[PDB]
CSV table of C-alpha atoms and ligand atoms in Angstrom, one decimal:
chain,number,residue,atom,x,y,z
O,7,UNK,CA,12.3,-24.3,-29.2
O,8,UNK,CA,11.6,-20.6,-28.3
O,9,UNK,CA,11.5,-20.4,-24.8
O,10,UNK,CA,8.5,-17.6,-24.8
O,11,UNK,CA,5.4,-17.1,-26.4
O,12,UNK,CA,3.1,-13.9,-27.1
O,13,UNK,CA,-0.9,-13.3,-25.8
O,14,UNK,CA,-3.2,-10.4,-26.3
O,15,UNK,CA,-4.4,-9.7,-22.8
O,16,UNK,CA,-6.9,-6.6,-23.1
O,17,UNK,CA,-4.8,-4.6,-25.0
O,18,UNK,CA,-1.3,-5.4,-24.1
O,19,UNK,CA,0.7,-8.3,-25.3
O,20,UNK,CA,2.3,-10.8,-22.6
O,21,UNK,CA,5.2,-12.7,-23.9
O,22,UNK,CA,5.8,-15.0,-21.5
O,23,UNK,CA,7.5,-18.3,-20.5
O,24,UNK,CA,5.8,-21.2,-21.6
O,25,UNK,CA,5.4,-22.2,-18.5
O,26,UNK,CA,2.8,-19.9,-17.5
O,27,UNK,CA,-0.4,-20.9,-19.4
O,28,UNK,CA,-4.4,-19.7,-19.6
O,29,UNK,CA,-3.2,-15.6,-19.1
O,30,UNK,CA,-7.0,-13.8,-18.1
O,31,UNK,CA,-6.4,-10.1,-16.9
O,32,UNK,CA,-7.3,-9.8,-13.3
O,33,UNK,CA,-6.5,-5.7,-13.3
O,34,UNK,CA,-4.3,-2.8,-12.6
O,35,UNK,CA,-2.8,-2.0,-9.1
O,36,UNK,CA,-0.9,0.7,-9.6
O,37,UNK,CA,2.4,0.2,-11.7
O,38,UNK,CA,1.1,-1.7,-14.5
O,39,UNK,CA,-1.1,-4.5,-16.3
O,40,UNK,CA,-1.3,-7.7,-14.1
O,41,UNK,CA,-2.9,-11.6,-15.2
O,42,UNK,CA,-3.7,-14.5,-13.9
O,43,UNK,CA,-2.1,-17.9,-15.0
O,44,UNK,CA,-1.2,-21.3,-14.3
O,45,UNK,CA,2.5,-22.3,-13.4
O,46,UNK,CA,2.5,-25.7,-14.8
O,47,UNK,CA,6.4,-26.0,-13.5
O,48,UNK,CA,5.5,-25.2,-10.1
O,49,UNK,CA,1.5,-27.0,-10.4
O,50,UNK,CA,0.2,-23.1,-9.3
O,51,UNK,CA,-1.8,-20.2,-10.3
O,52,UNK,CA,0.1,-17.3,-10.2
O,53,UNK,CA,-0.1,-13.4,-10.9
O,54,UNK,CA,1.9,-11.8,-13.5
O,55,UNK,CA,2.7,-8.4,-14.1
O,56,UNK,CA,4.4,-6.7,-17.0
O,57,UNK,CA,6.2,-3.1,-16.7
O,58,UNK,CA,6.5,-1.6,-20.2
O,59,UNK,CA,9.9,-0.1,-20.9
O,60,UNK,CA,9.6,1.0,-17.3
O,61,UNK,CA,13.2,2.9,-17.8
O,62,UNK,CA,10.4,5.5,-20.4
O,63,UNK,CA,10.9,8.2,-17.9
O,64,UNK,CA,12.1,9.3,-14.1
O,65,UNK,CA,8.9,8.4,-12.4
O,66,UNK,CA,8.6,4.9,-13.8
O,67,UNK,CA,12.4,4.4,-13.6
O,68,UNK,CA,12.9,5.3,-10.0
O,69,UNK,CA,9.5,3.2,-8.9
O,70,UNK,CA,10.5,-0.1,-10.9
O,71,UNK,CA,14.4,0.0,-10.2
O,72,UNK,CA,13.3,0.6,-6.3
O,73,UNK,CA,11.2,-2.2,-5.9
O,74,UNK,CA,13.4,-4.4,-7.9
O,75,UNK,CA,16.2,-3.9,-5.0
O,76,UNK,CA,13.7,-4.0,-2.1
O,77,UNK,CA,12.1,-7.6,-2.8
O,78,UNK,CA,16.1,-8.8,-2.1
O,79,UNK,CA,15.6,-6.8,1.6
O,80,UNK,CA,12.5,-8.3,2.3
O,81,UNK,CA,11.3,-11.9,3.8
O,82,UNK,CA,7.7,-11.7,5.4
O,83,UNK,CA,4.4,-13.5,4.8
O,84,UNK,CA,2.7,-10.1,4.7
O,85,UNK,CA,5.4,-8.2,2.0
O,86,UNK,CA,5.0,-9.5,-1.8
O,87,UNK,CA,7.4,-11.7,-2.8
O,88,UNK,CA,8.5,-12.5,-6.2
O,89,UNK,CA,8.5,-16.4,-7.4
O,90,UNK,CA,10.2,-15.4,-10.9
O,91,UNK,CA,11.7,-12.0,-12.8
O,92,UNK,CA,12.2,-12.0,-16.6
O,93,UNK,CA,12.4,-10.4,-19.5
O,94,UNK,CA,11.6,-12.1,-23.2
O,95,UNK,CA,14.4,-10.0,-25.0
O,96,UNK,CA,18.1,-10.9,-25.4
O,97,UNK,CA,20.4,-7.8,-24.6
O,98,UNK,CA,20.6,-4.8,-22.6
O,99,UNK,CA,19.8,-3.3,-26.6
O,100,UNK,CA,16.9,-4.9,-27.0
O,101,UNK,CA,15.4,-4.5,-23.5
O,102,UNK,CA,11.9,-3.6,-23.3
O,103,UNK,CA,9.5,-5.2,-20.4
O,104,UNK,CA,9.7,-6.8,-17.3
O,105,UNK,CA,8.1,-9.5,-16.3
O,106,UNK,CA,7.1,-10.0,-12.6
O,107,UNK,CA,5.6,-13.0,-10.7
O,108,UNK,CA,4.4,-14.1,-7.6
O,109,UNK,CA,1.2,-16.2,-5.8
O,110,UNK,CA,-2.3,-16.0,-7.1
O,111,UNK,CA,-4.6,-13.7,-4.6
O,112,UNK,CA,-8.2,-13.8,-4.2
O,113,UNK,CA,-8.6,-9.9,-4.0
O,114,UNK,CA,-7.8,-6.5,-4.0
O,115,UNK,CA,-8.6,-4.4,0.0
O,116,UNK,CA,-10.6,-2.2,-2.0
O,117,UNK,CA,-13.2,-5.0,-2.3
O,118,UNK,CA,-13.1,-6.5,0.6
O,119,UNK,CA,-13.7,-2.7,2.1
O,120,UNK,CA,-16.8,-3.1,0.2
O,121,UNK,CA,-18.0,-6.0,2.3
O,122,UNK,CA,-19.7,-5.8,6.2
O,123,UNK,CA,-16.9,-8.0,8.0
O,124,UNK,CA,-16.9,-9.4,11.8
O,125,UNK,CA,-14.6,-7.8,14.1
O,126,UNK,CA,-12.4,-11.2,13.5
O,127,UNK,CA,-11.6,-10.8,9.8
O,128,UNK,CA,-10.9,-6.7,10.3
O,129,UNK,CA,-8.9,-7.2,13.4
O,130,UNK,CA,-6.9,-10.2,11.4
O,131,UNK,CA,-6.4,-7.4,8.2
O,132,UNK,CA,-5.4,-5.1,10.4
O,133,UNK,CA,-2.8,-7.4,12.7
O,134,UNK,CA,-1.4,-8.6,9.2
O,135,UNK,CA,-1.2,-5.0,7.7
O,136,UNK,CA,0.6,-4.0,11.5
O,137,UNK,CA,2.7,-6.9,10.9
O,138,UNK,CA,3.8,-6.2,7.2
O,139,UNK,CA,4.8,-2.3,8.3
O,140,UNK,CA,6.8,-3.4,11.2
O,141,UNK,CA,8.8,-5.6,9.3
O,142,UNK,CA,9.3,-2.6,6.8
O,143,UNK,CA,10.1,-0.4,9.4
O,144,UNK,CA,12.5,-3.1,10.7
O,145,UNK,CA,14.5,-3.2,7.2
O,146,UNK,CA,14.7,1.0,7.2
O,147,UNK,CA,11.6,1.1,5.2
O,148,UNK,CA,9.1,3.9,5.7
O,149,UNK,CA,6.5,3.6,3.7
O,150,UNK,CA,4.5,6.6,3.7
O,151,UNK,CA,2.0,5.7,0.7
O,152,UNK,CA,0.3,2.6,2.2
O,153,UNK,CA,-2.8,2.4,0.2
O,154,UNK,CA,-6.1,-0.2,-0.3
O,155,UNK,CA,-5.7,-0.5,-3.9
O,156,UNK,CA,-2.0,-2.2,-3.4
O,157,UNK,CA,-2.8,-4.7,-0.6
O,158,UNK,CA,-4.0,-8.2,-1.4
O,159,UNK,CA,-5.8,-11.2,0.3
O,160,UNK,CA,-6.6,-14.5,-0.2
O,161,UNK,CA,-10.4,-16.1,0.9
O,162,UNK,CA,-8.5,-17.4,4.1
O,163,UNK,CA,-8.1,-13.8,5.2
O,164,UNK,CA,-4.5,-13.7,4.5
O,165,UNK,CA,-2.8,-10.6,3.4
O,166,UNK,CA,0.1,-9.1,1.3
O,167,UNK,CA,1.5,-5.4,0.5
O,168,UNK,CA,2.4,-5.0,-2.7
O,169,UNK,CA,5.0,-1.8,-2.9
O,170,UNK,CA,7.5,0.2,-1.1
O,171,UNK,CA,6.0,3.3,-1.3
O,172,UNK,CA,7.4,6.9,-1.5
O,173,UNK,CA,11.6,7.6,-2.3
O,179,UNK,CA,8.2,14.4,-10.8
O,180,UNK,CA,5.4,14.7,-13.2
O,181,UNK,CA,2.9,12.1,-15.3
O,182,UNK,CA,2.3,12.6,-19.4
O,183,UNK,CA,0.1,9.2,-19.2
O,184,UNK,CA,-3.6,9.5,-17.6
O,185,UNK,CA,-3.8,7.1,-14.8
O,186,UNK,CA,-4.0,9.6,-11.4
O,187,UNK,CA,-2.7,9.4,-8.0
O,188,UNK,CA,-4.8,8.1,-4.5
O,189,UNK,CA,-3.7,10.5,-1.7
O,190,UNK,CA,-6.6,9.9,0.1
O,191,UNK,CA,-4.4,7.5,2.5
O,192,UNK,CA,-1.3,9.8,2.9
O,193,UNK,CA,-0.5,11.3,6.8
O,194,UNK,CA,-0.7,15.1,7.5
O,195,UNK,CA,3.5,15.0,7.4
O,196,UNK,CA,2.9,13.7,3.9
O,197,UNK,CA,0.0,16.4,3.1
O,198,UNK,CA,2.1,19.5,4.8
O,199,UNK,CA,6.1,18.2,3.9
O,200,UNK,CA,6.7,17.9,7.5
O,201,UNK,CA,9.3,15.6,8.2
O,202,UNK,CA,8.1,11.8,9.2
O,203,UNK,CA,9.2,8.8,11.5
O,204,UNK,CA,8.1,5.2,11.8
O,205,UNK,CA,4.1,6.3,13.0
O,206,UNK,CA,3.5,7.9,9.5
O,207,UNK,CA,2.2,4.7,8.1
O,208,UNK,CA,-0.1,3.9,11.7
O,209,UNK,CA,-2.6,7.4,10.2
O,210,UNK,CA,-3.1,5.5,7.1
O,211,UNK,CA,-3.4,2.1,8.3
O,212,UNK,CA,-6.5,4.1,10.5
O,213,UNK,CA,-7.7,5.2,7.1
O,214,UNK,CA,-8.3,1.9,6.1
O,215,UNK,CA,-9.9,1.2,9.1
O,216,UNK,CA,-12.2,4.0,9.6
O,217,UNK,CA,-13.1,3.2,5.6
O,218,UNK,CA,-13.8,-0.5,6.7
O,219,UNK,CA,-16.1,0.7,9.4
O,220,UNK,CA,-17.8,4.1,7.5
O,221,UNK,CA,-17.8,2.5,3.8
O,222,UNK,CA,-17.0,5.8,2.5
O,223,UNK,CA,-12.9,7.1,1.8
O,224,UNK,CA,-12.4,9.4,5.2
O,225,UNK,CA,-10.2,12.4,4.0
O,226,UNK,CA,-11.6,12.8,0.0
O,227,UNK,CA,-10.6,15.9,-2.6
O,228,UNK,CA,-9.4,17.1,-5.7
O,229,UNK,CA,-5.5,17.7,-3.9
O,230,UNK,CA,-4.4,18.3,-0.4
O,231,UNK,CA,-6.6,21.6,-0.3
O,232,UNK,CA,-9.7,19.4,0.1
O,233,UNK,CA,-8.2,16.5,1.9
O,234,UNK,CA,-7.0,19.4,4.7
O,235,UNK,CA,-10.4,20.1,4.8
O,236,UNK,CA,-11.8,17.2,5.7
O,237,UNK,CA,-8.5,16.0,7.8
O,238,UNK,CA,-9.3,19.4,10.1
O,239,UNK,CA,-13.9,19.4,9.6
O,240,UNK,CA,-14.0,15.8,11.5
O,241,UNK,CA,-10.7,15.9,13.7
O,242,UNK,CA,-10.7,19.4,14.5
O,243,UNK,CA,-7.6,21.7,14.1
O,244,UNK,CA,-4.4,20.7,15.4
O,245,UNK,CA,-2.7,21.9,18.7
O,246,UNK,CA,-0.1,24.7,18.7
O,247,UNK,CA,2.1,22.3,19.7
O,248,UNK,CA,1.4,20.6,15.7
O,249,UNK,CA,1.9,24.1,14.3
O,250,UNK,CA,5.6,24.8,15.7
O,251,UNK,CA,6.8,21.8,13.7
O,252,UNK,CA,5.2,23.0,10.2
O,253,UNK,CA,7.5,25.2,7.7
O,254,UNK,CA,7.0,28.7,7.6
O,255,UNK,CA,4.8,29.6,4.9
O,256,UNK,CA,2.8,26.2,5.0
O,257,UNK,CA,2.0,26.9,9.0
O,258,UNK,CA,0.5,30.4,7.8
O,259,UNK,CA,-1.7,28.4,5.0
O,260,UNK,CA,-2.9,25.8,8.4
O,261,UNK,CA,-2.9,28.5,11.0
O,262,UNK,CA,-5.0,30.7,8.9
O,263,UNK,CA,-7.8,28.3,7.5
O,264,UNK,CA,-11.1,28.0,9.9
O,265,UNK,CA,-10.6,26.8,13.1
O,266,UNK,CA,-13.0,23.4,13.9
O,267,UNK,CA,-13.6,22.0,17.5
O,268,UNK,CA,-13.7,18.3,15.6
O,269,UNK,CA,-16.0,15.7,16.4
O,270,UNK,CA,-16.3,12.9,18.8
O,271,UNK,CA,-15.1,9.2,17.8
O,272,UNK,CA,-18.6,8.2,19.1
O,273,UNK,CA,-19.9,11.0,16.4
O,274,UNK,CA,-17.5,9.8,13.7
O,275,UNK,CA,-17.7,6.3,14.2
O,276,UNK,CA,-21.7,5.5,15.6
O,277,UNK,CA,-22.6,2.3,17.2
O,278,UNK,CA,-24.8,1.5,14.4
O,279,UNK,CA,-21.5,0.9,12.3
O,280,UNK,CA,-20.4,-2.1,14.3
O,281,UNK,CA,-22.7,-5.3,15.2
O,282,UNK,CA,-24.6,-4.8,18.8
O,283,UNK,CA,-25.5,-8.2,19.2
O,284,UNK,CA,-23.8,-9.9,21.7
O,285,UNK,CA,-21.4,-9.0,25.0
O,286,UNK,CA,-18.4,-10.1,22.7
O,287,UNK,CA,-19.9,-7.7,20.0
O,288,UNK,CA,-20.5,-4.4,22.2
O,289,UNK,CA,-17.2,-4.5,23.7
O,290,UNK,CA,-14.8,-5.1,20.6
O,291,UNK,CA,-17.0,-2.0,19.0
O,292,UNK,CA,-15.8,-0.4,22.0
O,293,UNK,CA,-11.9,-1.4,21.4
O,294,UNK,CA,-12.2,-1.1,17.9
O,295,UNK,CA,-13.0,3.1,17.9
O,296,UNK,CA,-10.7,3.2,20.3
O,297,UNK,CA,-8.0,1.9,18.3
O,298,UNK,CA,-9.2,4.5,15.7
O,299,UNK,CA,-8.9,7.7,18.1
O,300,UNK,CA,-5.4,6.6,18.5
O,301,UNK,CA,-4.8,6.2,14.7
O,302,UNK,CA,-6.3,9.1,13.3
O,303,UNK,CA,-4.1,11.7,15.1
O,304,UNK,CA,-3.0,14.6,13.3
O,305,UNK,CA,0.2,15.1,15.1
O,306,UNK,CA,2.5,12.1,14.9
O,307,UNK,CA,3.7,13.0,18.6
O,308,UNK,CA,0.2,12.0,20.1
O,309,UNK,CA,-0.7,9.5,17.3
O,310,UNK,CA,0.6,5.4,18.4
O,311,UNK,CA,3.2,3.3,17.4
O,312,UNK,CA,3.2,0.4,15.5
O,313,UNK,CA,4.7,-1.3,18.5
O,314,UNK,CA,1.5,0.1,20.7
O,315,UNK,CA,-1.0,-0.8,18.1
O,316,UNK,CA,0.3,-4.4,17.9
O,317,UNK,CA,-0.3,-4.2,22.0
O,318,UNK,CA,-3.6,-2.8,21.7
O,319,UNK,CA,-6.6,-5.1,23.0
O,320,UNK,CA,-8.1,-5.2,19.5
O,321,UNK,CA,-5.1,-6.5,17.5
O,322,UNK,CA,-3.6,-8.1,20.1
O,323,UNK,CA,-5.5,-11.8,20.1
O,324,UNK,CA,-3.7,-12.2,17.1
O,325,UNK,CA,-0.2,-11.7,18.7
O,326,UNK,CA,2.7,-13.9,17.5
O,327,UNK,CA,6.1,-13.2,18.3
O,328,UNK,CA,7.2,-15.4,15.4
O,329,UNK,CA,5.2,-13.0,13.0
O,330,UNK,CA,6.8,-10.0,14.4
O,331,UNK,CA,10.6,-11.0,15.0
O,332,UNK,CA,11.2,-12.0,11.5
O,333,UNK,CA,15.1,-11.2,10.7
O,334,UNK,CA,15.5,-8.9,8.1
O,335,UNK,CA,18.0,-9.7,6.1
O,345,UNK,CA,19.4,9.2,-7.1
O,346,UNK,CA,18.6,10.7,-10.6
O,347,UNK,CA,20.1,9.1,-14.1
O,348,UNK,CA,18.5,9.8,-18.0
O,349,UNK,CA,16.9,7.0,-20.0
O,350,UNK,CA,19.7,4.9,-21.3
O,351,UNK,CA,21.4,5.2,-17.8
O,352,UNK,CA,18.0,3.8,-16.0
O,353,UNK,CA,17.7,1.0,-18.7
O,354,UNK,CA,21.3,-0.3,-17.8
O,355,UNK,CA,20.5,-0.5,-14.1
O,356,UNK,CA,16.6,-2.1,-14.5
O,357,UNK,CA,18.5,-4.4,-16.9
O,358,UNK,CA,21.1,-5.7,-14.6
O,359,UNK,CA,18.6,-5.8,-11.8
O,360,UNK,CA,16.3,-8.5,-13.9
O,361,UNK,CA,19.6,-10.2,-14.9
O,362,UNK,CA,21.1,-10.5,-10.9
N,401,3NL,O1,-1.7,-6.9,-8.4
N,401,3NL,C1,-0.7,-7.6,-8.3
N,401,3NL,N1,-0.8,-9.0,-7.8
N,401,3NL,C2,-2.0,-9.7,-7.4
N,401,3NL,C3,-2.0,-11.0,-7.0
N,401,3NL,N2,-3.3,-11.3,-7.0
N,401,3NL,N3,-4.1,-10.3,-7.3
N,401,3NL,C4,-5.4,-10.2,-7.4
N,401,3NL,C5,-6.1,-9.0,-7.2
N,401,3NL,C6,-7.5,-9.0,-7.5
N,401,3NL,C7,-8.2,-10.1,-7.9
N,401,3NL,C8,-7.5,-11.3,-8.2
N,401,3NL,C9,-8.2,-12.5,-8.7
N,401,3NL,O2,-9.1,-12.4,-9.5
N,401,3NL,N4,-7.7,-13.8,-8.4
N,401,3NL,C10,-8.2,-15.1,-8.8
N,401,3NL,C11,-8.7,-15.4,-10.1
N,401,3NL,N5,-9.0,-16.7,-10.1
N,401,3NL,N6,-8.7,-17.2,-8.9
N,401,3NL,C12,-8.8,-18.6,-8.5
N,401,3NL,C13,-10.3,-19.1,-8.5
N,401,3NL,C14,-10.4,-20.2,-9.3
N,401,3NL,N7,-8.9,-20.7,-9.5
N,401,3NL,C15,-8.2,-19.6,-9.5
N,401,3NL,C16,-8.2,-16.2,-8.1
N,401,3NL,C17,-6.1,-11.4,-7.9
N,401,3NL,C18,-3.3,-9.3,-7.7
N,401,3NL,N8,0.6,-7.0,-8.7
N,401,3NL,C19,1.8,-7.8,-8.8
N,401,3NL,C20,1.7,-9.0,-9.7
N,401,3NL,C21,2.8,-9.8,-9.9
N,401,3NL,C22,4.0,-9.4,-9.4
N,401,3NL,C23,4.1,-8.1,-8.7
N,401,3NL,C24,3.0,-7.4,-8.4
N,401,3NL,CL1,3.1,-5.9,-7.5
């Protein structure tokens, strides 16, 4: 009769359809609590994720209602896209949770940064990641928060972002990773398209090192370690840095920076064979052109696709894909609402 039915699932409830059976938690991304079920309509297991009263305050609001919008401007294999959208209650009065599906994955990238991987698998993640970016770039989307803990992959190797990034203050306890974020990001600099290429060689240089790059408390610490093992920037960086910030850079101590050899040893990547030696070669390569402090010197996401390492992946298919403010509480819940309704 009802069309919905109610689980404890750690210690949230799901009311879901009944079409979605056998809920086990698989854990927490970022945005909320997330489960694994079968679809017995569409004979699939799926992932399902439920934001509670997400309209509760700005930060929360302004994230959901975002991401809502930006699944409609969105087609690629490498983007998350959503196989249903509800919510169990009734009216715009009742309105409480949202209800968010799409395909079962096999993994978070934090886990598979865990694991030693051939130069096949990591140059595949990273061509997919490349991919994924370009198309967001392509739809006026700069991401500028890319992160390990919101990509997914299946046991095939096959990858999927899961957010949209940046557009403020948390009274729940679950902290933010800026580990990932470009110095334009750490300094408010002003950004284009390459923002997202430094943390994309984050996630590389984790996936060779198996240790975060840039870590700290806040950006004091992450400067730190941004300026110990890249050295400081040019005065070239400096002149594009606002005033009292480029007396804060200008002013720490200043660090020569080491080697990509030195950062990223041979003993990091198999030495093996021929085939071996020379895609360690392209690989910290790639890196030194990643992990550039100013985004003048740092490469495109155009070059990076064009770089030998990524390259053998190449598909103009996978690449040309067409691409198709602040409000109180009750305001927000309107617009979430009518988002979930279409
Ligand atoms: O985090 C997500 N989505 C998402 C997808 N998959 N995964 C994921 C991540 C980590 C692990 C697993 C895992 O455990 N998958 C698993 C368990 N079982 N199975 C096989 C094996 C046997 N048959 C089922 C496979 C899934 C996480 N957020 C999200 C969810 C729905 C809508 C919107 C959003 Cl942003």
């Amino acid at each position: 009769d009802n069309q919905f039915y109610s689980v404890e699932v750690g210690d949230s409830t799901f009311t879901v359809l009944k079409r979605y059976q056998n809920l086990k938690p698989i854990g927490s991304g970022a945005q909320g609590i997330v489960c694994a079920a079968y679809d017995a309509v569409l004979d699939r297991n799926v992932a399902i994720k439920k934001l509670s009263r997400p309209f509760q305050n700005q930060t929360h609001a302004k994230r959901a209602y975002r991401e809502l919008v930006l699944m409609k401007c969105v087609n690629h294999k490498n983007i998350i896209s959503l196989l249903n959208v509800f919510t169990p209650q009734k009216t715009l009065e009742e309105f409480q949770d949202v209800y968010l599906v799409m395909e079962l994955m096999d993994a978070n990238l934090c886990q598979v940064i865990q694991m030693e991987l051939d130069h096949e698998r990591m140059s595949y993640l990273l061509y997919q990641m490349l991919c994924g970016i370009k198309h967001l770039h392509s739809a006026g989307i700069i991401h500028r928060d890319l992160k390990p803990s919101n990509i997914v992959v299946k046991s095939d190797c096959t990858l999927k972002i899961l957010d949209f990034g940046l557009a403020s203050f948390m009274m729940t306890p679950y902290v933010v990773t800026r580990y990932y974020r470009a110095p334009e990001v750490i300094l408010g600099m002003g950004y284009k398209e390459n923002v997202d290429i430094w943390s994309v060689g984050c996630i590389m240089g984790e996936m060779v090192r198996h240790k975060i790059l840039f870590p700290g408390r806040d950006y004091i610490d992450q400067w730190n370690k941004v300026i110990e093992q890249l050295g400081t920037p040019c005065p070239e960086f400096m002149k594009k840095l606002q005033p009292t910030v480029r007396n804060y850079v200008e002013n720490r101590p200043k660090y020569a920076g080491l080697t990509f050899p030195k950062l990223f040893p041979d003993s990091l990547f198999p030495a093996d064979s021929e085939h071996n030696k020379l895609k360690a070669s392209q690989a910290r390569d790639l890196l030194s052109k990643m992990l550039v402090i100013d985004p003048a010197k740092r490469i495109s996401v155009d070059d990076a696709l064009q770089h030998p390492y990524i390259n053998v992946w190449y598909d103009p298919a996978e690449v040309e894909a067409p691409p198709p403010r602040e409000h109180t509480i009750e305001e927000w819940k309107e617009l979430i609402y009518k988002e979930v309704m279409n």
